[PDB]
Amino acid sequence: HMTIRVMLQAMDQGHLLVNNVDKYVRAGRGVMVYIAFLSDRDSAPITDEALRHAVGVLLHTKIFTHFSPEKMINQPQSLEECPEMDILIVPQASLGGKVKGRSVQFHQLVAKDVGAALYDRFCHFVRVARGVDESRVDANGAPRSEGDAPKAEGWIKYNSRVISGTFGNRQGLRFESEGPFTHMFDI
Amino acid sequence: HMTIRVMLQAMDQGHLLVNNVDKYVRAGRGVMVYIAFLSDRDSAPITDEALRHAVGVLLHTKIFTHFSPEKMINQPQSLEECPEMDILIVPQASLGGKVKGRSVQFHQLVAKDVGAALYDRFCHFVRVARGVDESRVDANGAPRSEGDAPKAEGWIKYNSRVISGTFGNRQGLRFESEGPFTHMFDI
């Protein structure tokens, strides 16, 4: 079977480069997701029911403790129970890399076009589960009107965003966290 | 057997909170390493030869392509062949977390004192392999004289640093990357 590998970090602020040059899209407080789609030579392909299952694990699992600073007692919470948290998704296929002698081999990584399709589908499902108005956002989940985009510098509030990297691009990143509390799940 | 899980990211700049409040230590270009020590109930304890082996994997493997921007043709390079790159080590035991229903269980994580000992020993071996003058640095690998510390803001050059988080603290982070190219190795 095919594995969806994710690395999940507690995000306070993020900036992700989307055009390989100098255009960054922004997220506030929530979760930064690194994702890779992995495969055996003889593994069956990832269906929609399996992709949606993986989104459910991402959203339904109580993982992070930083969403609700106003809470008297902090417990792990799901993204689902905190609908306003932002999600920033970065394709990181290199998560499937393994050491081979003194180099790295990427034989577990799905082919480019398969990964592009799964990545696109996965970002769509997350947008839908977070109630994103897909007619008001661009390919990276940022506003279609540049005048609605968050300010370029200085702290911004979360706003139920689902921001995603441009597949196949260099994922230039600025990331701020009060404590990443990094999780790694194979799904 | 026990496992040293590491997540490795291409670092341009990093700031790591070391006192739970407002003191940050700095790294320039190199690699940011998240580390967890994992175990079965019936697994043997990690020896010094196995810790050193793990350091060898981190330093000898050609992984990253961002160390030498002056190179006409960029190939993966080892940290070993680029002695001036900085290393920023963050304890992230949560990497051993697994989904259990709608929560996370941490049953694979070594005990606190075992992890403290392995973490300390691992940071020591990295310092040694990078030629750090251990008499001129503090517990986090920053200068012992506060006047030799890098400037607090603005770009800084790499300088063969081995910076490491305070074990058991909250790992407040600011991270900049031209493309994290994230790897995940179980060693």
mmCIF file of C-alpha atoms in Angstrom:
data_model
loop_
_atom_site.group_PDB
_atom_site.id
_atom_site.type_symbol
_atom_site.label_atom_id
_atom_site.label_comp_id
_atom_site.label_asym_id
_atom_site.label_seq_id
_atom_site.Cartn_x
_atom_site.Cartn_y
_atom_site.Cartn_z
ATOM 1 C CA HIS A 1 0.000 0.000 0.000
ATOM 2 C CA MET A 2 0.859 3.692 -0.555
ATOM 3 C CA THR A 3 1.899 5.891 2.413
ATOM 4 C CA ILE A 4 1.049 9.569 2.931
ATOM 5 C CA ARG A 5 3.860 10.911 5.159
ATOM 6 C CA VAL A 6 3.275 14.193 6.953
ATOM 7 C CA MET A 7 5.411 16.298 9.277
ATOM 8 C CA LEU A 8 3.221 18.644 11.350
ATOM 9 C CA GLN A 9 4.488 21.683 13.264
ATOM 10 C CA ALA A 10 2.767 24.218 15.532
ATOM 11 C CA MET A 11 2.739 27.438 13.499
ATOM 12 C CA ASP A 12 2.422 30.971 14.846
ATOM 13 C CA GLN A 13 3.314 32.749 11.580
ATOM 14 C CA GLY A 14 4.378 31.548 8.126
ATOM 15 C CA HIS A 15 5.545 33.006 4.809
ATOM 16 C CA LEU A 16 5.793 30.681 1.801
ATOM 17 C CA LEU A 17 7.397 31.594 -1.535
ATOM 18 C CA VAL A 18 5.048 30.713 -4.404
ATOM 19 C CA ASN A 19 6.710 32.034 -7.627
ATOM 20 C CA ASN A 20 10.385 30.981 -7.129
ATOM 21 C CA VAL A 21 11.347 34.674 -6.884
ATOM 22 C CA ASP A 22 9.898 37.052 -4.275
ATOM 23 C CA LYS A 23 6.122 36.591 -3.883
ATOM 24 C CA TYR A 24 5.240 35.174 -0.436
ATOM 25 C CA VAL A 25 1.820 34.104 0.806
ATOM 26 C CA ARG A 26 1.053 34.298 4.495
ATOM 27 C CA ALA A 27 -0.513 32.268 7.254
ATOM 28 C CA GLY A 28 -1.129 33.023 10.917
ATOM 29 C CA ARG A 29 -1.536 30.666 13.829
ATOM 30 C CA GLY A 30 -2.281 27.048 13.097
ATOM 31 C CA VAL A 31 -0.394 24.099 11.627
ATOM 32 C CA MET A 32 2.346 23.824 8.991
ATOM 33 C CA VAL A 33 2.116 20.535 7.096
ATOM 34 C CA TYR A 34 4.966 19.015 5.084
ATOM 35 C CA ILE A 35 3.668 16.232 2.816
ATOM 36 C CA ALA A 36 5.105 13.391 0.732
ATOM 37 C CA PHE A 37 3.402 10.610 -1.145
ATOM 38 C CA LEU A 38 5.293 7.332 -0.956
ATOM 39 C CA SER A 39 5.020 3.964 -2.659
ATOM 40 C CA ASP A 40 6.338 0.417 -3.079
ATOM 41 C CA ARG A 41 6.822 -0.882 -6.619
ATOM 42 C CA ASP A 42 3.846 -3.197 -6.019
ATOM 43 C CA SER A 43 1.633 -0.896 -3.910
ATOM 44 C CA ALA A 44 -1.973 -0.011 -4.881
ATOM 45 C CA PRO A 45 -2.761 3.652 -5.755
ATOM 46 C CA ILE A 46 -4.298 6.154 -3.313
ATOM 47 C CA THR A 47 -8.065 6.510 -3.866
ATOM 48 C CA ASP A 48 -10.217 9.488 -2.893
ATOM 49 C CA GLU A 49 -11.581 7.593 0.141
ATOM 50 C CA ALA A 50 -7.975 7.084 1.282
ATOM 51 C CA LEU A 51 -7.016 10.756 0.670
ATOM 52 C CA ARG A 52 -10.101 11.913 2.620
ATOM 53 C CA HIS A 53 -9.155 9.494 5.385
ATOM 54 C CA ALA A 54 -5.764 11.142 5.586
ATOM 55 C CA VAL A 55 -7.354 14.595 5.781
ATOM 56 C CA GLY A 56 -9.518 13.260 8.628
ATOM 57 C CA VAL A 57 -6.418 12.190 10.535
ATOM 58 C CA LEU A 58 -4.941 15.655 10.015
ATOM 59 C CA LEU A 59 -8.112 17.461 11.175
ATOM 60 C CA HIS A 60 -9.747 15.099 13.729
ATOM 61 C CA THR A 61 -6.713 14.099 15.773
ATOM 62 C CA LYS A 62 -6.085 16.166 18.908
ATOM 63 C CA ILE A 63 -2.416 17.001 18.447
ATOM 64 C CA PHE A 64 -1.482 20.596 19.293
ATOM 65 C CA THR A 65 -1.762 22.671 22.498
ATOM 66 C CA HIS A 66 -1.160 26.182 21.122
ATOM 67 C CA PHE A 67 -4.449 27.003 19.323
ATOM 68 C CA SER A 68 -6.298 28.476 22.304
ATOM 69 C CA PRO A 69 -4.041 30.636 24.525
ATOM 70 C CA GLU A 70 -7.196 31.858 26.346
ATOM 71 C CA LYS A 71 -7.778 28.331 27.792
ATOM 72 C CA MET A 72 -7.264 27.988 31.535
ATOM 73 C CA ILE A 73 -5.983 24.442 31.069
ATOM 74 C CA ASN A 74 -4.264 23.648 27.755
ATOM 75 C CA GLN A 75 -5.054 20.211 26.287
ATOM 76 C CA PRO A 76 -4.263 18.901 22.784
ATOM 77 C CA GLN A 77 -7.007 20.014 20.376
ATOM 78 C CA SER A 78 -8.026 19.049 16.878
ATOM 79 C CA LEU A 79 -7.987 21.459 13.982
ATOM 80 C CA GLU A 80 -11.624 20.421 13.531
ATOM 81 C CA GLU A 81 -12.668 21.906 16.896
ATOM 82 C CA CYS A 82 -10.696 25.096 16.097
ATOM 83 C CA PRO A 83 -12.076 26.077 12.628
ATOM 84 C CA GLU A 84 -10.275 29.454 12.519
ATOM 85 C CA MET A 85 -6.728 28.096 12.732
ATOM 86 C CA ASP A 86 -4.719 28.463 9.510
ATOM 87 C CA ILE A 87 -3.113 25.534 7.682
ATOM 88 C CA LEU A 88 0.009 25.960 5.565
ATOM 89 C CA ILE A 89 0.795 22.975 3.309
ATOM 90 C CA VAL A 90 4.221 22.491 1.803
ATOM 91 C CA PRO A 91 5.052 19.677 -0.638
ATOM 92 C CA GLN A 92 8.194 17.949 0.661
ATOM 93 C CA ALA A 93 8.653 14.764 -1.353
ATOM 94 C CA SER A 94 12.191 14.428 0.074
ATOM 95 C CA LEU A 95 10.617 13.058 3.322
ATOM 96 C CA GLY A 96 10.676 9.684 1.504
ATOM 97 C CA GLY A 97 14.445 9.855 1.009
ATOM 98 C CA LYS A 98 16.579 7.143 2.600
ATOM 99 C CA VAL A 99 20.327 6.900 3.219
ATOM 100 C CA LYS A 100 22.210 4.748 0.686
ATOM 101 C CA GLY A 101 25.913 4.591 1.544
ATOM 102 C CA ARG A 102 26.916 8.264 1.658
ATOM 103 C CA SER A 103 24.082 9.498 -0.522
ATOM 104 C CA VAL A 104 20.278 9.644 -0.492
ATOM 105 C CA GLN A 105 17.942 7.575 -2.660
ATOM 106 C CA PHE A 106 14.382 8.575 -3.471
ATOM 107 C CA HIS A 107 13.048 5.241 -4.780
ATOM 108 C CA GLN A 108 10.009 5.367 -2.387
ATOM 109 C CA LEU A 109 8.759 8.670 -3.921
ATOM 110 C CA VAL A 110 5.729 8.464 -6.239
ATOM 111 C CA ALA A 111 6.264 9.696 -9.792
ATOM 112 C CA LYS A 112 6.012 13.428 -10.445
ATOM 113 C CA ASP A 113 2.598 13.494 -12.141
ATOM 114 C CA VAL A 114 1.069 11.089 -9.636
ATOM 115 C CA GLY A 115 2.376 13.247 -6.788
ATOM 116 C CA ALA A 116 1.134 16.427 -8.468
ATOM 117 C CA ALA A 117 -2.364 14.910 -8.757
ATOM 118 C CA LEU A 118 -2.460 13.583 -5.190
ATOM 119 C CA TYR A 119 -1.081 16.884 -3.842
ATOM 120 C CA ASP A 120 -3.633 18.936 -5.699
ATOM 121 C CA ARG A 121 -6.452 16.614 -4.575
ATOM 122 C CA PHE A 122 -5.240 16.662 -0.998
ATOM 123 C CA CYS A 123 -5.131 20.482 -0.894
ATOM 124 C CA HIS A 124 -8.647 20.629 -2.414
ATOM 125 C CA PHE A 125 -10.023 18.279 0.284
ATOM 126 C CA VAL A 126 -8.426 20.378 3.053
ATOM 127 C CA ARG A 127 -9.898 23.599 1.599
ATOM 128 C CA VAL A 128 -13.333 21.952 1.496
ATOM 129 C CA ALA A 129 -13.072 20.618 5.086
ATOM 130 C CA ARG A 130 -12.082 24.112 6.278
ATOM 131 C CA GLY A 131 -14.944 25.873 4.476
ATOM 132 C CA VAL A 132 -12.706 27.852 2.111
ATOM 133 C CA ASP A 133 -14.529 29.826 -0.600
ATOM 134 C CA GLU A 134 -12.579 28.380 -3.526
ATOM 135 C CA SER A 135 -13.956 31.111 -5.872
ATOM 136 C CA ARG A 136 -12.260 33.853 -3.778
ATOM 137 C CA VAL A 137 -8.764 32.284 -3.570
ATOM 138 C CA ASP A 138 -5.935 31.574 -6.004
ATOM 139 C CA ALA A 139 -3.912 28.424 -6.635
ATOM 140 C CA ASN A 140 -2.015 28.834 -3.326
ATOM 141 C CA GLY A 141 -5.148 29.618 -1.279
ATOM 142 C CA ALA A 142 -4.372 33.330 -0.941
ATOM 143 C CA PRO A 143 -6.938 36.013 -1.921
ATOM 144 C CA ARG A 144 -7.774 36.461 -5.648
ATOM 145 C CA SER A 145 -7.926 40.215 -5.070
ATOM 146 C CA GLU A 146 -4.394 41.358 -4.129
ATOM 147 C CA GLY A 147 -6.062 44.116 -2.051
ATOM 148 C CA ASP A 148 -7.570 41.508 0.308
ATOM 149 C CA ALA A 149 -4.177 39.864 0.893
ATOM 150 C CA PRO A 150 -2.778 40.250 4.435
ATOM 151 C CA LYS A 151 -0.167 42.965 4.975
ATOM 152 C CA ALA A 152 3.312 41.885 3.890
ATOM 153 C CA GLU A 153 5.064 42.362 7.271
ATOM 154 C CA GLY A 154 4.109 42.383 10.976
ATOM 155 C CA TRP A 155 1.946 39.917 12.916
ATOM 156 C CA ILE A 156 -1.310 38.751 11.315
ATOM 157 C CA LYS A 157 -4.264 36.994 12.858
ATOM 158 C CA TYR A 158 -5.312 33.534 11.691
ATOM 159 C CA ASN A 159 -8.402 33.551 9.408
ATOM 160 C CA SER A 160 -9.412 29.966 8.531
ATOM 161 C CA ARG A 161 -6.819 29.854 5.715
ATOM 162 C CA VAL A 162 -5.613 26.877 3.738
ATOM 163 C CA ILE A 163 -2.388 28.076 2.112
ATOM 164 C CA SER A 164 -0.445 25.685 -0.100
ATOM 165 C CA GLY A 165 2.848 25.678 -1.972
ATOM 166 C CA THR A 166 3.138 25.664 -5.737
ATOM 167 C CA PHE A 167 3.913 22.067 -6.633
ATOM 168 C CA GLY A 168 7.368 21.596 -8.176
ATOM 169 C CA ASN A 169 8.575 25.031 -6.989
ATOM 170 C CA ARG A 170 11.354 25.830 -4.519
ATOM 171 C CA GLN A 171 9.596 26.222 -1.151
ATOM 172 C CA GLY A 172 11.255 29.336 0.257
ATOM 173 C CA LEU A 173 10.069 29.659 3.847
ATOM 174 C CA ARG A 174 9.943 31.926 6.866
ATOM 175 C CA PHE A 175 8.456 30.153 9.888
ATOM 176 C CA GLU A 176 7.796 31.336 13.482
ATOM 177 C CA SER A 177 6.675 29.039 16.266
ATOM 178 C CA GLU A 178 6.254 29.178 20.031
ATOM 179 C CA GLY A 179 7.372 25.485 20.030
ATOM 180 C CA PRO A 180 6.957 23.326 16.902
ATOM 181 C CA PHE A 181 5.972 20.150 18.858
ATOM 182 C CA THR A 182 6.736 18.341 15.655
ATOM 183 C CA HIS A 183 4.776 15.215 14.798
ATOM 184 C CA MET A 184 5.524 12.706 12.038
ATOM 185 C CA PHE A 185 2.668 10.453 10.863
ATOM 186 C CA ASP A 186 2.615 7.764 8.229
ATOM 187 C CA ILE A 187 -0.953 7.378 7.071
ATOM 188 C CA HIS B 1 16.762 -2.102 18.741
ATOM 189 C CA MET B 2 16.325 1.599 19.500
ATOM 190 C CA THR B 3 15.960 4.362 16.863
ATOM 191 C CA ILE B 4 17.351 7.872 16.495
ATOM 192 C CA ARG B 5 14.768 9.687 14.396
ATOM 193 C CA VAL B 6 15.924 12.934 12.828
ATOM 194 C CA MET B 7 14.207 15.518 10.637
ATOM 195 C CA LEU B 8 16.759 17.566 8.678
ATOM 196 C CA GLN B 9 16.076 20.911 6.980
ATOM 197 C CA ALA B 10 18.187 23.243 4.870
ATOM 198 C CA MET B 11 18.769 26.271 7.100
ATOM 199 C CA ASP B 12 19.658 29.766 5.966
ATOM 200 C CA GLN B 13 19.085 31.436 9.336
ATOM 201 C CA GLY B 14 17.792 30.275 12.699
ATOM 202 C CA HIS B 15 16.884 31.678 16.105
ATOM 203 C CA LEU B 16 16.222 29.276 19.002
ATOM 204 C CA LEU B 17 14.748 30.224 22.371
ATOM 205 C CA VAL B 18 16.916 28.764 25.159
ATOM 206 C CA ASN B 19 15.510 30.191 28.474
ATOM 207 C CA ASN B 20 11.713 29.783 27.971
ATOM 208 C CA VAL B 21 11.374 33.580 27.920
ATOM 209 C CA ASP B 22 13.253 35.866 25.486
ATOM 210 C CA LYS B 23 16.881 34.739 25.015
ATOM 211 C CA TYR B 24 17.534 33.461 21.481
ATOM 212 C CA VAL B 25 20.725 31.876 20.176
ATOM 213 C CA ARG B 26 21.521 32.174 16.487
ATOM 214 C CA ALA B 27 22.711 30.063 13.601
ATOM 215 C CA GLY B 28 23.453 30.968 9.995
ATOM 216 C CA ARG B 29 23.500 28.738 6.929
ATOM 217 C CA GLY B 30 23.608 25.019 7.455
ATOM 218 C CA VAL B 31 21.266 22.324 8.734
ATOM 219 C CA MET B 32 18.503 22.366 11.364
ATOM 220 C CA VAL B 33 18.138 18.979 13.030
ATOM 221 C CA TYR B 34 15.067 17.834 14.990
ATOM 222 C CA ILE B 35 15.904 14.745 17.074
ATOM 223 C CA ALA B 36 13.989 12.080 19.002
ATOM 224 C CA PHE B 37 15.161 8.919 20.674
ATOM 225 C CA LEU B 38 12.740 6.025 20.335
ATOM 226 C CA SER B 39 12.436 2.579 21.798
ATOM 227 C CA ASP B 40 10.531 -0.704 21.995
ATOM 228 C CA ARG B 41 9.815 -2.130 25.455
ATOM 229 C CA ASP B 42 12.352 -4.887 24.689
ATOM 230 C CA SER B 43 14.939 -2.856 22.732
ATOM 231 C CA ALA B 44 18.642 -2.595 23.710
ATOM 232 C CA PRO B 45 19.998 0.804 24.909
ATOM 233 C CA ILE B 46 21.858 3.116 22.503
ATOM 234 C CA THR B 47 25.620 2.818 23.088
ATOM 235 C CA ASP B 48 28.305 5.407 22.348
ATOM 236 C CA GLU B 49 29.346 3.587 19.166
ATOM 237 C CA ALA B 50 25.740 3.716 17.934
ATOM 238 C CA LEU B 51 25.445 7.448 18.866
ATOM 239 C CA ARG B 52 28.665 8.167 16.954
ATOM 240 C CA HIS B 53 27.380 6.103 14.054
ATOM 241 C CA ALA B 54 24.328 8.315 13.973
ATOM 242 C CA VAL B 55 26.488 11.440 13.978
ATOM 243 C CA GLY B 56 28.412 9.938 11.033
ATOM 244 C CA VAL B 57 25.188 9.515 9.090
ATOM 245 C CA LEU B 58 24.275 13.143 9.781
ATOM 246 C CA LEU B 59 27.723 14.479 8.731
ATOM 247 C CA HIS B 60 28.974 12.065 6.032
ATOM 248 C CA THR B 61 25.821 11.669 3.947
ATOM 249 C CA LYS B 62 25.558 14.023 0.960
ATOM 250 C CA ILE B 63 22.072 15.443 1.460
ATOM 251 C CA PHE B 64 21.770 19.169 0.890
ATOM 252 C CA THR B 65 22.385 21.377 -2.183
ATOM 253 C CA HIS B 66 22.344 24.874 -0.609
ATOM 254 C CA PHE B 67 25.748 25.005 1.214
ATOM 255 C CA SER B 68 27.862 26.347 -1.647
ATOM 256 C CA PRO B 69 26.006 28.951 -3.746
ATOM 257 C CA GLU B 70 29.338 29.706 -5.539
ATOM 258 C CA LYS B 71 29.340 26.214 -7.160
ATOM 259 C CA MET B 72 28.778 26.235 -10.919
ATOM 260 C CA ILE B 73 26.907 22.925 -10.675
ATOM 261 C CA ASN B 74 25.086 22.226 -7.384
ATOM 262 C CA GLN B 75 25.262 18.619 -6.140
ATOM 263 C CA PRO B 76 24.259 17.245 -2.712
ATOM 264 C CA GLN B 77 27.141 17.742 -0.268
ATOM 265 C CA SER B 78 27.922 16.414 3.160
ATOM 266 C CA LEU B 79 28.286 18.605 6.204
ATOM 267 C CA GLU B 80 31.707 16.951 6.557
ATOM 268 C CA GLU B 81 32.979 18.450 3.273
ATOM 269 C CA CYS B 82 31.582 21.844 4.296
ATOM 270 C CA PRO B 83 33.120 22.357 7.804
ATOM 271 C CA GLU B 84 31.947 25.998 8.126
ATOM 272 C CA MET B 85 28.207 25.295 7.863
ATOM 273 C CA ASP B 86 26.236 25.736 11.069
ATOM 274 C CA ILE B 87 24.171 23.025 12.759
ATOM 275 C CA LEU B 88 21.105 23.865 14.899
ATOM 276 C CA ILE B 89 19.866 20.903 16.978
ATOM 277 C CA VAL B 90 16.374 20.942 18.457
ATOM 278 C CA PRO B 91 15.078 18.191 20.749
ATOM 279 C CA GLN B 92 11.683 17.063 19.360
ATOM 280 C CA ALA B 93 10.679 13.891 21.166
ATOM 281 C CA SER B 94 7.167 14.268 19.751
ATOM 282 C CA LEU B 95 8.483 12.847 16.420
ATOM 283 C CA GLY B 96 7.844 9.421 17.996
ATOM 284 C CA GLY B 97 4.153 10.196 18.529
ATOM 285 C CA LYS B 98 1.597 7.967 16.795
ATOM 286 C CA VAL B 99 -2.140 8.403 16.193
ATOM 287 C CA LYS B 100 -4.379 6.440 18.564
ATOM 288 C CA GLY B 101 -8.058 6.977 17.714
ATOM 289 C CA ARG B 102 -8.408 10.766 17.851
ATOM 290 C CA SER B 103 -5.388 11.366 20.071
ATOM 291 C CA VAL B 104 -1.608 10.903 20.045
ATOM 292 C CA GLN B 105 0.284 8.293 22.093
ATOM 293 C CA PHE B 106 3.957 8.638 22.931
ATOM 294 C CA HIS B 107 4.711 5.061 24.023
ATOM 295 C CA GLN B 108 7.740 4.828 21.621
ATOM 296 C CA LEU B 109 9.541 7.755 23.369
ATOM 297 C CA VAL B 110 12.464 6.896 25.662
ATOM 298 C CA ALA B 111 12.142 7.991 29.262
ATOM 299 C CA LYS B 112 13.013 11.568 30.148
ATOM 300 C CA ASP B 113 16.376 10.954 31.831
ATOM 301 C CA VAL B 114 17.490 8.466 29.165
ATOM 302 C CA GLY B 115 16.614 10.995 26.454
ATOM 303 C CA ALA B 116 18.326 13.826 28.335
ATOM 304 C CA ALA B 117 21.515 11.704 28.492
ATOM 305 C CA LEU B 118 21.405 10.613 24.839
ATOM 306 C CA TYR B 119 20.609 14.192 23.735
ATOM 307 C CA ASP B 120 23.505 15.653 25.717
ATOM 308 C CA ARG B 121 25.895 12.968 24.436
ATOM 309 C CA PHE B 122 24.699 13.446 20.856
ATOM 310 C CA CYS B 123 25.230 17.227 20.967
ATOM 311 C CA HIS B 124 28.700 16.681 22.481
ATOM 312 C CA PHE B 125 29.725 14.278 19.664
ATOM 313 C CA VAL B 126 28.480 16.752 17.041
ATOM 314 C CA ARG B 127 30.474 19.614 18.640
ATOM 315 C CA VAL B 128 33.581 17.399 18.651
ATOM 316 C CA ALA B 129 33.122 16.365 14.994
ATOM 317 C CA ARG B 130 32.769 20.042 14.026
ATOM 318 C CA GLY B 131 35.863 21.166 15.960
ATOM 319 C CA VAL B 132 33.957 23.368 18.403
ATOM 320 C CA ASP B 133 36.094 24.815 21.214
ATOM 321 C CA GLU B 134 33.940 23.545 24.063
ATOM 322 C CA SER B 135 35.732 25.872 26.553
ATOM 323 C CA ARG B 136 34.520 29.002 24.689
ATOM 324 C CA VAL B 137 30.812 28.012 24.351
ATOM 325 C CA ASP B 138 27.886 27.699 26.771
ATOM 326 C CA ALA B 139 25.328 24.881 27.206
ATOM 327 C CA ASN B 140 23.585 25.822 23.944
ATOM 328 C CA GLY B 141 26.844 26.179 21.972
ATOM 329 C CA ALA B 142 26.678 29.985 21.847
ATOM 330 C CA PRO B 143 29.655 32.146 22.962
ATOM 331 C CA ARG B 144 30.580 32.057 26.659
ATOM 332 C CA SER B 145 31.423 35.776 26.375
ATOM 333 C CA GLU B 146 28.152 37.580 25.493
ATOM 334 C CA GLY B 147 30.263 40.128 23.563
ATOM 335 C CA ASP B 148 31.309 37.472 21.023
ATOM 336 C CA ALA B 149 27.675 36.481 20.397
ATOM 337 C CA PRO B 150 26.357 37.308 16.904
ATOM 338 C CA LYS B 151 24.269 40.461 16.510
ATOM 339 C CA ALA B 152 20.663 39.947 17.587
ATOM 340 C CA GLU B 153 19.020 40.973 14.261
ATOM 341 C CA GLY B 154 19.891 41.026 10.530
ATOM 342 C CA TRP B 155 21.651 38.395 8.432
ATOM 343 C CA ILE B 156 24.646 36.606 9.950
ATOM 344 C CA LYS B 157 27.267 34.450 8.296
ATOM 345 C CA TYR B 158 27.696 30.806 9.227
ATOM 346 C CA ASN B 159 30.724 30.169 11.477
ATOM 347 C CA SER B 160 31.114 26.419 12.161
ATOM 348 C CA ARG B 161 28.520 26.553 14.959
ATOM 349 C CA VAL B 162 26.832 23.703 16.761
ATOM 350 C CA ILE B 163 23.845 25.311 18.466
ATOM 351 C CA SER B 164 21.499 23.130 20.529
ATOM 352 C CA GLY B 165 18.261 23.676 22.433
ATOM 353 C CA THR B 166 17.930 23.398 26.182
ATOM 354 C CA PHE B 167 16.552 19.943 26.834
ATOM 355 C CA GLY B 168 13.105 20.016 28.417
ATOM 356 C CA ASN B 169 12.456 23.630 27.418
ATOM 357 C CA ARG B 170 9.913 25.046 25.006
ATOM 358 C CA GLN B 171 11.684 25.339 21.648
ATOM 359 C CA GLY B 172 10.621 28.810 20.475
ATOM 360 C CA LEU B 173 11.852 29.124 16.902
ATOM 361 C CA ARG B 174 12.380 31.527 14.028
ATOM 362 C CA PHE B 175 13.510 29.691 10.888
ATOM 363 C CA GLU B 176 14.424 30.941 7.388
ATOM 364 C CA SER B 177 15.145 28.667 4.462
ATOM 365 C CA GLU B 178 15.587 28.981 0.695
ATOM 366 C CA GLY B 179 13.879 25.531 0.456
ATOM 367 C CA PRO B 180 13.917 23.150 3.436
ATOM 368 C CA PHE B 181 14.384 19.990 1.317
ATOM 369 C CA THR B 182 13.288 18.097 4.384
ATOM 370 C CA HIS B 183 14.643 14.654 5.052
ATOM 371 C CA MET B 184 13.498 12.166 7.685
ATOM 372 C CA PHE B 185 15.937 9.366 8.650
ATOM 373 C CA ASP B 186 15.476 6.575 11.154
ATOM 374 C CA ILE B 187 18.952 5.539 12.243
#
